[PDB]
Structures are given as structure tokens and as C-alpha cells.
Design a binder for these strands. Structure first.
Lengths: 487, 489
DNA sequence: TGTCCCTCTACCTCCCT
DNA sequence: AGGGAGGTAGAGGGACA
DNA sequence: TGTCCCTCTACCTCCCT
DNA sequence: AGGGAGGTAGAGGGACA
């Protein structure tokens, strides 16, 4: 038992012993933990399983896995056992919040720092607990929290930022570095022919952090003069994680991609202005000719695919799957492009390849309906949810397949479907809506909160007729309903 | 013999000729041009009168009077005939926009500068033509336009203002001075005194902005330490035309008013926080004991606490007795009429029109008082006199409905718009007269009606999911702003 | 003087909830 | 509907050709 | 090498026109 | 209907130890 067994041997032994309660974990979940937490975390999960799952902690297996699967995972598991009770009982944090803080590399450090600093940050006229939890819920959360403590005063007093803007900058991986760099570079960047303070805060708040701010300082003059970009365009490229990489790649590839009958600067900016913009741009360079020759695409289509986050993944997946999808599944290049042209296009394409037969045969949808569901951000999520909920929505709530498809065919389709499942009964039976009206409300981006907002208004109102509320919900969803409140 | 006699005689001669076609100007119009544009303006109107009135320009006589009635009016008249076509074709401006630009001292300079700078302001600076027209449409518009061109970058970048805030500052007489002063004083007022950029923009965003900004810098310390005013109260006093005068008068009279009459600092600040705040404060000091020896202190404060405070106080002193005696009003009613911007105008108009509205139109004194008891009450009262017969006889409204439309700020505008749009909303789109009256019976009645007519006349996609009844409920709830927000969906 | 620009006061209308 | 904001008219001073 | 921190990439949902 | 904004999970690697 106690022994000098090798690393894999130790891992597999623990795996053997984790087949059952309270912590039943498959090799997959064990792989997830091990990639980051290592065999160390797996052994820690094994050692502490009963206390983690038992009272007063009451963590689900899902929460335990989430804490364990990070660098230092063993340390975070030990620390949550000690500090969760403390943070919840003495500071009124929820377990969800504590788990959120714990589930990042170095979670031990973040938890101990929230314990130490929450009392000083949340004094009168200070931060809310929610803001502290948000800052802490990233890798290096300890560093970000200590740096907010230090620099909140100078950033607000000397540089004129609001505490909310400071929290926004701090609430990213490498937040400490972003805060220190804003402090240093604000005066430099914000001069005539420079940036606005708003643009500096945006770059510092959007993921790209210190590196993006430093690269804009470095490259703004040459990008805006020799390369002819606007400061707005430069800020758009800078305002994602990896902004530095996209900026440098634009510098290098603008001369290459914008020659006669190539791309325009505006096309290049659109490709670069997403997370992974460097990868998207390099992949466009590599694959534009071959996608156009081999699969009959046009440059405009290639650019369209590339102009979303994960553009590299979508282009490579089009290269790989367009033939399979057209030949075996009967889709057209246009339909394949349509599915590919959203964030997560790779995920949607692979899910269409996998689920299209099942959806057309067993559930009776047409390929066109499947394409329609797939052709939105999170298309994979919406396709899988249609597969899951179509029969129950049609049988128990009496919807038609066409109505289910309409609910699903928008960004957040998964959320809207699940919310229709939840709320259709109360909306119809308690407030006299028809399923038609519920479907109409749900059949837009932001379908979920539109439904939630209308159920809430119909339950405890602050007028406007119910049909008028429904029309507003359809027109503008939750934001429409909230606009009416302020009237 | 007197030197100015030849010019005056020249003036009266040409003036007589302008009473004929194609302008048929009246006495008031002629005095106005002579007073503000001088003899060169009156002569210019005569010389250009044919070129301006018909094809191509087709300006109305009142438009010609608007352009002529400013220093350099002669210059502006010449420039408008020359540049109006160039600005309507080269930049897509309307004639009404060109006339608005021309209708200020130095309108020539503004027109020429709009011609020269509009492209660069809209292209390189991102401003819209509407924003350029607004900046241009003040005395010294040329200076404001040039300064916006020169300073928009440094103000947005080095000072963190939005382009909208810069336009707001520029869109006042003396815009150039306000912009240059904001550039210099923004860091000082924010960092030394804790003001937000928003507050500084608000101080700068009035006529005499520069003066108010420099006075806040000078007096903020003294006012907040000695007198116990807060930065917010100082900003509030500063945030009007003549802000400087108001602030300096507050320093002088705060203690005097508080000791001798027992006002609080709160009441003093309220009196000071209008256009003419200086005059209001000084008048409260000399008149309060006179009024109260009678009215209560609290009533005097209420009257004083609106723009034109001095005028209303003085008018109440003069008319309080004759209105209560001859016209059977109470002191509380006279105070109510007086306690709005333009109180003096409303009081004098009540004195003139109460007997007429009562006898000729069958209104009650209470209805007359209700119409008068809003800002622009004079205008609403005069419009009721004019339009009550046509609204009732031609459009089927009851006197009660007409009084309801009239009894809000902008009542004149609402009444005229109802007269104008009632038939189209009812006959063409099937609104009931009661629905039209409901939309009109709020502040902003006019624009709410126009927004509603706009939708049902050229059906915009956004407003389509909303039925006429829903649109009516929205228009009544939040007027043009609500309708406009819906359009944005 | 004629013109341009700036400041102050009074008055009117619409907005924001 | 109550305080707040945004706008136009009118008049006078400084400045200067 | 485990722990911590930072940087970069990919994916999902909702908002705003 | 087509971007814009904001949120998350996950991979890789440097520093340190």
C-alpha cells in the first residue's frame, strides 16, 4: 500500500479504487485531472474523497474534479477543506463562489488571499464581495488581489479610473501585470496622436493585458502611419487575449496579404480582431489558395470563415471535412461555409458530420434544418440539445419540430431550448400565453433571459398589456423589457 | 445740426420701400433689423430683396429678417445667396440649416468656415454634419469650428473627453474660449478639487463657459471652506450662463440672506442656480421684506428659484394687488404663475388675457391659471386664445381637452402640432381623438406626436411588431425618447 | 463705422425617470 | 411630475480694420 | 518536478442595432 | 442579420525550487 510503486502504477491503482462511491470517476475524468493536477492530484482526490463529499463540505464529484484539475490541484483540495467553511460562514460567500476561486492554477494562494484581503477590500466604500470573488477567480488571483489593494488608490486618484474599471482590468489572467502596466503607460499612450484613456482601459481589460499594452505602445506609430491602420483598428486587434501576437502578425502579413488583388487592410483587421487572430491570419496565408482550388471556395468565403474566433480551427476543419460533408451527407460548399463561419465553427462542423444522420432519420429533420441549427455560435451545443429535447418538447409540451428548430436556430439555442422546457408550463397555464407566443419569444438570440424576464414581470409586476409585453420581448428581449422599466 | 440725421433719414426711406413687395415687412421687423444689423443691413435687404425671395433660394421674409438682424447682416445676406446652393449640393445641408448658420453675428465667417471645414471634420475627425451645423450655429461659430478641428484630438486623447462632450462644449457662444479653458483647467479642477470630467464639461457647456470655469477654480476653495457649500452646490451654481456672476454673487449674499432673512444655504443655491442667478439673489435681498410685510418668505424663495427670478419678483410686486383685486385671484395662484421660467411674461399675459379667455372662450379662472402655471405660460395662453375656436369647432375637441394639451411646458407647440396632425392620425391611421389628446398632454407632446406620425407614415421595421395601440401607450409613457428607443431594436 | 467675437440675462421647450 | 438639461433672443462690451 | 504565474488560443452566450 | 462584448475552459511554458 505505502510503497515505491512508479507513477503510472500508482495512478492506475487509485483509478481501480475510484470505480465506486462516493467518488466514482472514470479514466476520462482521471485523465482530465492528471493533465494538469498530475498523479499528485489524483492521489489527493483518492485520499480525501470522503471528507470532500461528506458534510459539512458536500462537494459534488463534478466540483471535486474541477478543483483537482489544475496545477497545484492537491494544494487547492487541501485548502478548500480548510477555508470553504470559513469563507462561507464568516464572510457569506456561497460554496459555488469558493469553488470558483479554488478552480484555477494556484487555487490555494487565491483562497488564502481572499481570506486575508476580503476584510480589507470590503470595508465601507470599498469593493463588493462579488468583485473580490471575480478578481480572485483567475490564475494568479492572489497576485491580482494584492495589486488591486496596492494600486486602487493611485489608479483612481492620479489616473481618474473608476473602481469598476480597475476591477475590470484586474479580472483577467495576469491581472497584476495589466494593472501595473496601465499605471505605467497611461500617460505615455494618452497624448495627441495616441490613444484615449477609454481605449487603454479596453485593451487592459480584454485579455491581452500587459503584452498587448506594451505592443501597442511599440507598434502604434508604424501600424498607423506606414501600415495605414486607424488607432481604432489597432485597438480592436489589441483587445483580445494574445493581442500582442495578432498585432505583430498584422505588422508582418499586411505587406504580404494586401498586394494587388489580395486582401484589403480591412479584411486583415477583421481576421486579426479575434482571439487567436495570429493563428487565423497565418492559416489564411497557408490555406486560401488550396481551399479555393481544391474545394471550390472563393477568397471572400475563406475570409468569412477566418473572421471568427478559432478561425484557424474552422479553416482546417473545412479543408478536412468539406469533401466528406458534400459527398456523404449531400451538403453544398455554401452550406459548409455557413456552418464554419461562427465561433466554434470546427465544433459545429464535426457535430453536423456526426449527428446529421441521426437527426434526419430518427427525429425526422431535413438536412436544411440541421444546417440552420448548426449555423450559429455554439452550433454544437444547439445540435446536441435538439437531439436530446426534441422528443420531450414535441410529446410533453406539444410543440412541432419546426418550432423546436426555430427555437434552436440562434446563438444560445441550447439555453433557449432548455428554458422553453422549464418555463412553457407556467407561461401558458399561469399567465395565459400560448405555446406559439412562448416560441416567438424564445426564437431570438437571448431567448433564455427574454423568457426569464417575462415570467418575472408576469409574476411580480411594477400599465402595459401582456400582449404588449410579449411583443416587446420578441422585439428586444430582456433589454427591451428593462428599457420599459426605466420609463 | 445733428450728424446722425442723414443716416437716420436714409434708414427711414429704404425702410418705407421694404414695406412693399416682395417682403412686406412690418414695423417690428424693420426696427429689429435696424437695431441689430444697422443701416447697412437695412440697405442690403433692399438691394438683395428680389434675389433672396423667389427662385432659386425662395427664402421667406422672416428668414431674410433672421439673417439680416445681426452685426454683419449685410455680409451674411451676400454670403447666403452665394453659398446656400454650394452647401446644399456639396455637403447635403438643407436651406433651413444654412439659414440657421447664417443667423448670428459674423454669419459670413461661419458659413465660409462650414464650407471649408465640414469635409475634414466629418472625414478625419468623425463628426456628423448635424454636429458641424450645431457648432457653427452660434456667434463666433468660425472660431469654435477651427478650435474643434485643432483640439478634438488632444481633448479626447490627453484629457479623456468624448467627441460628444467636445461638441457640447463647442456648441455655445464663446465655444473657442470654453474649449481652450477646459484643455488648461480640466486636470486642475479634477485633481485639485475632485470634480469629475462630467462636472467640468457641464460647467464648460454654457455661454460664458470660460468665465465660469476660471471662477470655479478661483472660488471653489473659499466657498466650500468658509460658507460650507459643497462642490456639488458650486458646480450647480456654475452650470448656467453667467455662472461666474452667480458664483461671485453667492459669495457676497449668502451670509446676508442667511442672517437677515433666515434662508438656508440650500435655498440660496437654488436661487443662484439659474440664468441670471446674480440678479435673482440681489433682488431677493432688496425685495423680500417688501413682499413679506403679505407673501411668506418661503413663497418669495420659490419665485426667485427660477430663471428670470428678478423679473418675476418685480412683476409680482407690481401686479399682486391688481390681480387679486380686479381679477379675483389669490396670492397662492399669483405665486404659482410666477414660479416658472418667464414668470413675468406669464403674469402679464394672465392680466391681459384672463378676462378674454373667461368671457370670450368660457374658460374658468382656474383653467387660465393652470395654463399659465408652466414654463412658457405666455405662449400657451396666447396659443389657446388663437386655436381654441378651430380646435373645438373644426376638430371636435372639447375646451377641457384643449386646456389639457395646453397645460404643460411646450403647450404652444403641442397645441399647434395637434391642430396640424390630428386629422392625419385620425382619418389615415385610425387613432381616436382621445388617443391624440393623450399623447399631446405631456411635456414633449409635439415631438411625441411627430414620432408617432413618422412611424405610421413611413413604417420603420423596428416599430412594426408594435400595434398602433402599443405605440400610443409608449408615446404616452415616454414620448419621442421611448419611441426612438424602440426604433433602436 | 462695420464686423467679428464673447458674456450675460431672460425666456421657451424637452428630457429623465 | 419634479428636478434637470438644452436651446434661442436680445443686448452690450472688447477688438480691430 | 510540482506549484505558481503569465500568456495565448478556442468556444459559448447575449447584446445592439 | 452581422459584429461587438463579455464570460469560460484549456494548453504551454518560464521561474523557482
Amino acid at each position: 500500500q505505502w510503497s515505491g510503486a512508479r507513477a503510472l502504477e500508482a495512478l492506475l491503482t487509485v483509478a481501480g479504487e475510484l470505480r465506486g462511491p462516493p467518488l466514482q470517476l472514470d479514466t476520462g475524468q482521471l485523465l482530465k485531472i492528471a493533465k494538469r493536477g498530475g498523479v499528485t492530484a489524483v492521489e489527493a482526490v483518492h485520499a480525501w474523497r470522503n471528507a470532500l463529499t461528506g458534510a459539512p463540505l458536500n462537494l459534488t464529484p463534478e466540483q471535486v474534479v474541477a478543483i483537482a484539475s489544475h496545477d497545484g490541484g492537491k494544494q487547492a483540495l487541501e485548502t478548500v477543506q480548510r477555508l470553504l467553511p470559513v469563507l462561507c460562514q464568516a464572510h457569506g460567500l456561497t460554496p459555488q463562489q469558493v469553488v470558483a476561486i479554488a478552480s484555477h492554477d494556484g487555487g490555494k494562494q487565491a483562497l488564502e488571499t481572499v481570506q486575508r484581503l476580503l476584510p480589507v477590500l470590503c470595508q465601507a466604500h470599498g469593493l463588493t464581495p462579488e468583485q473580490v470573488v471575480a478578481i480572485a477567480s483567475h490564475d494568479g488571483g492572489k497576485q491580482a488581489l494584492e495589486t488591486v489593494q496596492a494600486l486602487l488608490p493611485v489608479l483612481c486618484q492620479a489616473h481618474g479610473l473608476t473602481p469598476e474599471q480597475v476591477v475590470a482590468i484586474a479580472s483577467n489572467g495576469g491581472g497584476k501585470q495589466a494593472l501595473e502596466t496601465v499605471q505605467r503607460l497611461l500617460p505615455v499612450l494618452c497624448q495627441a496622436h495616441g490613444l484615449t484613456p477609454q481605449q487603454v482601459v479596453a485593451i487592459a481589460s480584454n485579455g491581452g493585458g500587459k503584452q498587448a499594452l506594451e505592443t501597442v505602445q511599440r507598434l502604434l506609430p508604424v501600424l498607423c502611419q506606414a501600415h495605414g491602420l486607424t488607432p481604432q483598428q489597432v485597438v480592436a486587434i489589441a483587445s483580445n487575449g494574445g493581442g500582442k501576437q495578432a498585432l505583430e502578425t498584422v505588422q508582418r502579413l499586411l505587406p504580404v496579404l494586401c498586394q494587388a488583388h489580395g486582401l484589403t487592410p480591412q479584411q486583415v483587421v477583421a481576421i486579426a480582431s479575434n482571439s487567436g487572430g495570429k493563428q487565423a491570419l497565418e492559416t489564411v496565408q497557408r490555406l486560401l489558395p488550396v481551399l479555393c482550388q481544391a474545394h471550390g471556395l472563393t477568397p471572400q468565403q475563406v475570409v468569412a470563415i477566418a473572421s471568427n474566433g478559432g478561425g484557424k480551427q474552422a479553416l482546417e476543419t473545412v479543408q478536412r471535412l468539406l469533401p466528406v460533408l458534400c459527398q456523404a451527407h449531400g451538403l453544398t460548399p455554401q452550406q459548409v461555409v455557413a456552418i464554419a463561419s461562427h465561433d466554434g465553427g470546427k465544433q459545429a462542423l464535426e457535430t453536423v458530420q456526426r449527428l446529421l444522420p441521426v437527426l434526419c432519420q430518427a427525429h425526422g429533420l431535413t438536412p436544411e434544418q440541421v444546417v440552420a441549427i448548426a449555423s450559429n455560435g455554439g452550433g454544437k451545443q444547439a445540435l446536441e440539445t435538439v437531439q436530446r429535447l426534441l422528443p420531450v418538447l414535441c410529446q410533453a409540451h406539444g410543440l412541432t419540430p419546426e418550432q423546436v428548430v426555430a427555437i434552436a436556430s440562434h446563438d444560445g439555442g441550447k439555453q433557449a431550448l432548455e428554458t422553453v422546457q422549464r418555463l412553457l408550463p407556467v407561461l401558458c397555464q399561469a399567465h395565459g400565453l400560448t405555446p406559439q407566443q412562448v416560441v416567438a419569444i424564445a426564437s431570438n438570440g437571448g431567448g433564455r433571459p427574454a423568457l426569464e424576464s417575462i415570467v418575472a414581470q408576469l409574476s411580480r409586476p411594477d400599465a402595459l398589456t401582456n400582449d404588449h409585453l410579449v411583443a416587446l420581448a420578441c422585439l428586444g428581449g430582456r433589454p427591451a423589457l428593462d428599457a420599459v422599466k426605466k420609463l
